[PDB]
């Protein structure tokens with residue numbers, strides 16, 4: 001839980017992923033995965049670390065993602 005990942009909405013604001021989704025993204029990022037799949041809200045997303053984007057695999061919409069360190073000690 002060393003990171004808080006965020007995604008960018010259409011109006012340009014950043015939203016934190018939930019703790020579990022941040023954990024999933026972070027774990028894949030840490031080991032050098034190129035991409036992972038994430039399901040939330042019944043939607044299927046590819047998290048593409050080569051381009052640092054979240055891609056909706058049905059609509060083709062790509063959104064920026066970014067990582068913030070989590071200060072909180074285990």
Ligand SMILES: Nc1ncnc2c1ncn2[C@@H]1O[C@H](COP(=O)(O)OP(=O)(O)OP(=O)(O)O)[C@@H](O)[C@H]1O
Nearest residue numbers: 007008009010040041043054056059060061062063
């Ligand atoms: N990781 C996420 N968690 C929650 N909401 C998200 C996430 N990514 C996108 N959204 C929101 O979900 C909606 C759909 O975004 P998404 O990128 O899935 O597809 P889209 O092609 O923009 O939209 P639509 O399905 O309406 O054509 C938008 O309101 C967007 O801000």
